[PDB]
Amino acid sequence: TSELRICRIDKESGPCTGGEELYLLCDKVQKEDISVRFSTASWEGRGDFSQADVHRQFAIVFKTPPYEDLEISEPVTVNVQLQRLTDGECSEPLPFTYLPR
């Protein structure tokens, strides 16, 4: 009920030793009333996090634009950043590298 839904998890595997920090996207949840359950029919484990570790982030889904040179033989890491249409204000850049076919 109240629809608990996990949209995604950054990783899909990790050391069985645990302790690996991850993050998951999901629908609305009560930070003062929510936990992450790792489990099997016979075992159960809980992800470790505080209320502060629960954020209300915005997310954008989009397809990457093709690169100017499709014949690059070397990886080319360019910049990616948010830009406001109205004033052309940008955010700090983040990297993303293009690979050759």
Next chain:
Amino acid sequence: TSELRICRIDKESGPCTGGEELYLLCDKVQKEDISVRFSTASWEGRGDFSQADVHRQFAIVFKTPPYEDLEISEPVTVNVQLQRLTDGECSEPLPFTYLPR
């Protein structure tokens, strides 16, 4: 200004041919006033997405609990899901596999 900030991008590389669907987490943005800029000092490209492709997701950061058996020799993909403390209501499970040291 108005602090445009990209928190993360699911991938950090992809084909130079583009067209690869990705997603980025970021602070508040005006879906009717925002764009993604791919660039270099001499080139500029724009991520393709509609207003609908802009979501207001919640995200949880946490460390994975260690697995019951640290001596597993085979990968063990268990279940991960949200669980409400109060009523123990769970969300659909999503997989995550543990690997051996």
